[PDB]
A and B are shown apart, each in its own frame.
Chain A
């Protein structure tokens, strides 16, 4: 587990991989876009130090599964996806490490799973849109943007140092 807050490269790398995974301009996609409603009250609220670790583990799992789909693997570049899968699994192991050890992670009530359920539902909405859009590149770009906006705010719990109040 990562007890001392020295630095972090996991989120940084994953964030970069998603950036290089771009195909077209996002502003050129003003149609296949819609607020998916990224749950923040179950991410940044209450959950902070280690509390969001179980959520992140299952969240990345959803990301992994979604991107490992034959549909996603045919939308992005396999070369980038290869490292993406690697980084995702790397971070997955990093997160579950705290769950393996006797750290105060799974100490919270059913709320530790409730946040996860919210993620599964969030991704379900995404997949639903993808199905309707027939997994078009424009839709994927926005979907990727959502995952990019959500994932960044996922590890942001420790990366946040703007307001102490």
Chain B
């Protein structure tokens, strides 16, 4: 199968590997990585080597946030390697941000969006991205991308107005970089404000 999936949980990259079991059932795996500049420096993540875990998380292991870390998995069947697939993921293309909790309060005429982002200082982390607040009032799909600078350091408060009573809106939290490709449409939260 060699299906690799990565998810960003509070600025932390967690990667999991989906493997099917036809006949042989490997319970242990090993994950290795490297930069896209030169696939000559193969490195392995500690704890994520010869382990029974199906996922590996890192914090500062990935210093090249502005690069594409190549992914390689070594499938071991007991005491012998079975297969090894090669893949590659671009952080500026994926950056799947779903774990962060988001709340929304619907008032008589305005909507108070409150996204709960990890409390961190932006002056201590290189994060180039454009967070977009998806809106869907009464079926009308809209997208709003405000100033992320100094606003993604915690509770992202956004006010949506210019609407009328009885507006059911579904808010989603996704982000864009170069274009609308990283459409990480998180579970749309539908809320209805006072009707009329």
Chain B positions within 8 Å of A162 at CB level: 65, 124-126
**Candidate in B72, B88, B122 with the most chain A CB atoms within 10 angstroms:** B88
Do B37 and A26 touch across chains, with their CB atoms under 8 A apart? Answer: no
Q: Which of A56-64, A99-107, A153-161 contacts B (4 or more CB under 8 A)?
A: A153-161
Interface segment, B51-59, B158-166, B173-181? Answer: B173-181
Q: What DSSP secondary structure best describes chain B's contact surface?
A: loop
B92 at the interface (CB under 8 A from A): yes
The reply to whether B66 and A156 form a contact with Cβ atoms under 8 Å apart is yes
Contacts between chains A and B (CB distance < 8 A), count: 78
> Are A16 and B93 within 8 A (Cβ)?
yes
Instruction: Tell me if A12 and B178 are in contact (CB < 8 A).
Output: yes
Q: Which A residues are in CB contact (< 8 Å) with B177?
A: 12, 16
Interface residue count for A (Cβ, 8 Å)?
31
**Interface size (B, Cβ < 8 Å)?**
31
Say what secondary structure dominates the interface of chain A. helix
A25 at the interface (CB under 8 A from B): yes
- Picked from B36, B92, B126, the residue with its CB within 8 Å of the CB of A160 is B126
**A9-27 CB contact bits vs B (8 Å, 1 = yes)?**
1001101100100000111
Tell me the B18-39 residues at the A interface (CB within 8 Å): 35-39
CB distance from B164 to the nearest CB of A (A): 33
Q: Given A28-B86, A161-B122, A164-B124 in contact, is the A152-B38 Cβ separation under 8 Å?
A: no
Which A residues are within 8 Å of any B CB, using their own CB?
7, 9, 12-13, 15-16, 19, 25-30, 33-35, 38, 142, 145-146, 148-149, 152-153, 156, 159-164
Cross-chain pairs A/B with CB under 8 angstroms, 16 sampled: A15-B178, A16-B178, A16-B179, A19-B90, A26-B70, A27-B87, A33-B39, A35-B37, A145-B37, A145-B68, A149-B35, A159-B66, A161-B122, A161-B127, A162-B65, A163-B124
